[PDB]
Amino acid sequence: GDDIYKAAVEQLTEEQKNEFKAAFDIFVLGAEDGCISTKELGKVMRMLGQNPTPEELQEMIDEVDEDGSGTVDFDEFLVMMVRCMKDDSKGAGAGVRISADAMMQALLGARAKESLDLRAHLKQVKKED
Ligand SMILES: [Ca+2]
């Protein structure tokens, strides 16, 4: 719920949205109305190999809960993913920081890992001086 996120998602185009559109399909695996609830949200996040807290499941949605329905949609999730990208970069943040690049392999598959390994590099120093 910040400008840094809304500003990022705003830049995203159909090309990028398309990738997310397919993700939701798997993310809502089991859901009745193809929605992302806390029940599944916890399995999808833990599927990557994490053991976060139960409260986080709700807090995560609360952040993107505008309609106050209690579920994350394609539009809501759009903002969530934006935060993910700016979650690992921060560094030092609890023992579970979901990432858009990491979660990808979860939906796309294991091949996604071998396909791209940019995360491994991790570098960003302009060095002005
Ligand atoms: Ca909702």
Phi, psi (degrees; rounded to nearest 5) at 98: -55, 145
Residue 39 lies in a domain: yes
Q: Encode 41-71: b = buried (16+ Cβ within 10 Å), e = exposed.
A: bbebbeeeeeebeeebbeebbebbbeeeeeb
Residue 28 lies in a domain: yes
Residue 60 lies in a domain: yes
CATH of the domain at 83: 1.10.238.10
Known binding residue 71? Answer is yes
Known binding residue 66? Answer is no
* Rounded-to-5 percentages of helix, strand, coil across the chain: 60, 5, 40
d(CA 120, ligand 1 centre) in Å: 34
Please state, in angstroms and rounded to a whole number, the distance separating the CA atoms of residues 43 and 46: 5
Known binding residue 67? Answer is yes
Bridge partners, residue 72, by sequence = 36
Please state, in angstroms and rounded to a whole number, the distance separating the CA atoms of residues 122 and 2: 25
Q: How was this structure determined?
A: NMR
Please state, in angstroms and rounded to a whole number, the distance separating the CA atoms of residues 111 and 98: 19
- Helix 3-11 to helix 74-88 angle, to the nearest 10 degrees? 110
CB 101 within 8 A of CB 56: no
Please state, in angstroms and rounded to a whole number, the distance separating the CA atoms of residues 105 and 107: 5
d(CA 57, ligand 1 centre) in Å: 13
Residue 127 lies in a domain: no
Residue 76 lies in a domain: yes
d(CA 7, ligand 1 centre) in Å: 21
Q: How many domains does the chain have?
A: 1
Residue-range definition of the domain harbouring residue 108: 3-120
Residue 35 lies in a domain: yes
Known binding residue 25? Answer is no
Known binding residue 53? Answer is no
Bridge partners, residue 95, by sequence = 93
